[PDB]
Amino acid sequence: SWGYREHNGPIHWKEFFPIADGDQQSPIEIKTKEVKYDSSLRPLSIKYDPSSAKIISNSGHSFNVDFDDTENKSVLRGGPLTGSYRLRQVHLHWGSADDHGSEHIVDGVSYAAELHVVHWNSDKYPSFVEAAHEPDGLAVLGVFLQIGEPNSQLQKITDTLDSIKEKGKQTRFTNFDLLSLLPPSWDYWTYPGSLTVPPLLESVTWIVLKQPINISSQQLAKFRSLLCTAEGEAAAFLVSNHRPPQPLKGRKVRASFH
Numbered sequence: 222s223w224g225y226r227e228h229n230g231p232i233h234w235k236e237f238f239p240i241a242d243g244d245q246q247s248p249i250e251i252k253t254k255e256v257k258y259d260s261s262l263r264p265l266s267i268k269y270d271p272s273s274a275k276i277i278s279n280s281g282h283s284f285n286v287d288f289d290d291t292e293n294k295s296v297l298r299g300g301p302l303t304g305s306y307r308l309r310q311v312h313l314h315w316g317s318a319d320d321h322g323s324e325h326i327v328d329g330v331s332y333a334a335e336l337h338v339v340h341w342n343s344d345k346y347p348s349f350v351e352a353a354h355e356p357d358g359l360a361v362l363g364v365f366l367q368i369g370e371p372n373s374q375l376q377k378i379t380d381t382l383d384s385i386k387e388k389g390k391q392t393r394f395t396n397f398d399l400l401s402l403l404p405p406s407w408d409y410w411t412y413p414g415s416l417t418v419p420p421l422l423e424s425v426t427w428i429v430l431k432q433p434i435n436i437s438s439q440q441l442a443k444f445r446s447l448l449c450t451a452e453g454e455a456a457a458f459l460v461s462n463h464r465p466p467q468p469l470k471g472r473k474v475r476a477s478f479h
């Protein structure tokens with residue numbers, strides 16, 4: 222199955238999910254001179270309940286913090302969105318070097334990593350799985366990480382990693398104040414796109430914050446010590462898990478600010 226190693230990595234995904242070569246694929250290059258300021262975009266309306274976080278797991282592809290998405294305690298509204306998008310899960314993408322780890326790239330700057338906050342449209346769809354197949358179904362908030370001072374909220378995640386080193390492992394994780402993890406400015410870019418992992422469905426309204434948050438180099442390096450292999454299989458490390466930028470194909474990237 223798919224991964225980020227030589228034989229199964231991004232350049233091969235098109236062979237086994239042809240929508241990899243679709244018209245609305247993510248991530249992208251964000252060219253700030255090409256983006257259009259749009260006065261109809263709204264500020265983000267963000268409500269994240271720290272008690273919504275329940276479990277952290279290693280998928281083999283990243284870690285995932287799963288939130289209880291039974292009801293509307295944690296939702297994203299506003300921004301480019303119509304209606305209410307329910308928080309489902311948080312995960313991270315990084316590279317082998319601090320030099321180049323994010324998925325979206327801004328005027329050629331990669332960041333050290335990129336956090337994705339995944340939400341689904343419960344005002345139109347009954348479940349995440351249904352929403353994931355529709356153009357208006359999902360909203361992802363992307364937040365860049367740059368190397369700087371250690372991040373006390375991220376230290377809570379890094380403290381769990383030894384317990385989920387193998388693919389498939391999980392452990393309880395709650396009291397996670399996602400709202401306080403976001404940067405001071407919520408100015409953003411937005412465009413229509415896709416999941417950045419198989420199945421690569423073109424169901425995502427991307428919301429990428431301009432301002433990065435900081436992480437230390439030692440905290441970021443802990444993520445690379447997760448395995449992409451399960452207990453009992455020959456070990457291989459998830460040292461890098463970001464997809465390259467994909468063609469814009471005529472989409473409009475809009476800015477909430479100017």
Ligand SMILES: NS(=O)(=O)c1ccc(C(=O)CSc2ncccn2)cc1Cl
Pocket residue numbers: 285309310337338339359361415416417418425
């Ligand atoms: N890179 S990305 O585009 O932000 C992205 C990555 C993975 C997934 C999922 O596979 C589903 S959210 C979920 N995943 C596993 C279990 C329960 N919910 C969805 C998205 Cl939008």
Ligand SMILES: [Zn+2]
Pocket residue numbers: 312313314337417
């Ligand atoms: Zn992601």
